[PDB]
A paper describes a structure:
In contrast, the NTQ rhodopsin functions as a light-driven inward chloride pump (called ClR). Here we report the atomic crystal structure of ClR from the flavobacterium Nonlabens marinus S1-08T. The structure reveals two chloride ion-binding sites, one at the active centre of the pump and the other on a loop in the cytoplasmic side, suggesting the pathway of chloride ion movement in ClR. The ClR structure comprises a short N-terminal helix, seven transmembrane helices (TM A–TM G), a C-terminal helix and three loops connecting the transmembrane helices on both extracellular and cytosolic sides.
Because Asn98 and Thr102 are the only residues of ClR directly interacting with Cl−-I, we investigated whether the interaction between Asn98 or Thr102 and Cl−-I is essential for the chloride-pumping activity of ClR. We expressed several ClR mutants (N98A, N98D and N98L for Asn98; and T102D, T102N and T102V for Thr102) in Escherichia coli cells. Of the mutants, T102N retained ∼70% of its pumping activity compared with the wild-type protein, whereas T102D completely lost its pumping activity. T102N's absorption spectra showed a blue shift in 1.5 M NaCl (λmax from 562 to 529 nm) suggesting that a chloride ion can bind at PSB but T102D's absorption spectra did not change in 1.5 M NaCl. We crystallized T102N and T102D proteins and collected diffraction data. In the T102D crystal structure, on the contrary, the side chain of the introduced Asp interacts with both PSB and Asn98, preventing the binding of a chloride at the Cl−-I site. Taken together, these results show that the direct hydrogen bond between Asn98/Thr102 (Asn98 and Thr102) and Cl−-I is crucial for the binding of Cl−-I, as well as for the chloride-pumping activity of ClR. We thus speculate that the decreased ion translocation might have arisen from the weakened binding affinity between the mutant ClRs and chloride.
Numbering used by the authors: -2 to 265
The structure:
């Protein structure tokens, strides 16, 4: 369906190129699932005010891990090694699934941030609402644009412009809330959380770069590079970010007197 519309369909891949992609996707699932166990064992040390943030991390890990596992399988299904190269056998591969996943992943990532920020009640709800709508606006317009990567580069770029507008607006909101709510962080995670904003800024920005590969590197190597950028971005935005949110959650929990949090931080 969407497979003819992505640049992966245009090329034949060397055994090294095809195998590198498969290995990236495979490693990615391994990292996400390993992280998943860790987020899972560690959540018993998070006080309940914050425990939902850690659960969100586990949710993202599986959600992202499943999409990667599936991409890896869709990749091996799509091509066969014939006459010295991997050649397209059928229309089973597309990047469209990543976008669909982001529809779920991003709200989860944002919500875990708001929780450690100590937002609650009406503010949490309203902030969450504006953020996810902005995010959905970004993702959907982006999804529409990627559909035109094979045949209409101007069109991919215009949808890209619209997508970026939502992105910038989303960043302004998360940035503003982090900066206005820092003084309330305990432990003192007021310092850590600003690092979390910079990481997001860096990691999230890699997705747009990946989106533009058809525009500047329209060849088989470009395909490899985009999967690589997705990989760096995925580990940075989901896993590394997740480890920080959890750290902040544990630290805030101990500072507020939750004992399992204190014993845990202490036993290390
Ligand atoms: C777990 C997944 C994450 C954190 C994905 C984040 C994705 C983006 C920030 C996507 C951004 C885009 C633009 C701002 C412009 C082009 C289209 C997108 C969707 C790639
Ligand atoms: C689009 C829908 C957005 C709904 C936002 C979900 C809010 C999370 C829980 C916050 C709360 O109500 O305290
Ligand atoms: C390439 C795109 C990167 C764009 C912006 C963010 C990169 C910088 C992050 C540095 C960390 C700053 C800090 O911790 O104070
Ligand atoms: C910060 C997150 C780190 C992400 C992990 C990514 C791991 C891969 C890194 C480097 C390997 C580069 C080697 C590429 C050899 C090219 C072979 C070919 O494509 O033909
Ligand atoms: C070079 C590779 C760097 C990779 C960094 C990866 C994960 C870092 C996240 C760990 C959380 C640190 C908590 C902050 C603290 O200890 O004060
Ligand atoms: Cl609590």
């Amino acid at each position: 369906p969407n497979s003819m519309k992505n640049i992966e369909s245009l090329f034949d891949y060397s055994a090294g190129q095809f195998e590198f992609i498969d290995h990236l996707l495979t490693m990615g699932v391994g990292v996400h699932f390993a992280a998943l166990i860790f987020f899972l064992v560690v959540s018993q040390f998070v006080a309940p005010k914050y425990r939902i943030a850690t659960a969100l991390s586990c949710i993202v890990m599986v959600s992202a891990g499943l999409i990667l596992n599936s991409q890896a399988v869709m990749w091996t299904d799509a091509y066969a090694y014939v006459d010295g190269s991997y050649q397209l056998q059928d229309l089973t591969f597309s990047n469209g699934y990543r976008y669909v996943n982001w529809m779920a992943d991003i709200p989860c990532l944002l919500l875990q941030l708001l929780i450690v920020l100590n937002l609650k009640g009406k503010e949490l709800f309203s902030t969450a609402t504006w953020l996810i709508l902005a995010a959905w606006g970004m993702i959907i317009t982006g999804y529409v644009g990627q559909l035109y990567e094979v045949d209409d580069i101007a069109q991919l770029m215009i949808w890209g412009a619209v997508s970026t507008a939502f992105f910038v607006v989303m960043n302004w909101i998360v940035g503003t809330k982090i900066f206005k709510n820092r003084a309330t962080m305990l432990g003192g995670t007021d310092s850590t959380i600003t690092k979390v904003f910079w990481l997001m800024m860096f990691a999230w920005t890699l997705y747009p770069i990946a989106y533009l590969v058809p525009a500047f590197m329209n060849n088989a190597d470009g395909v490899v590079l985009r999967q690589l950028l997705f990989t760096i971005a995925d580990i940075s935005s989901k896993v590394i970010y997740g480890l920080m949110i959890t750290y902040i959650a544990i630290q805030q929990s101990a500072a507020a007197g939750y004992v399992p949090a204190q014993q845990a931080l202490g036993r290390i």
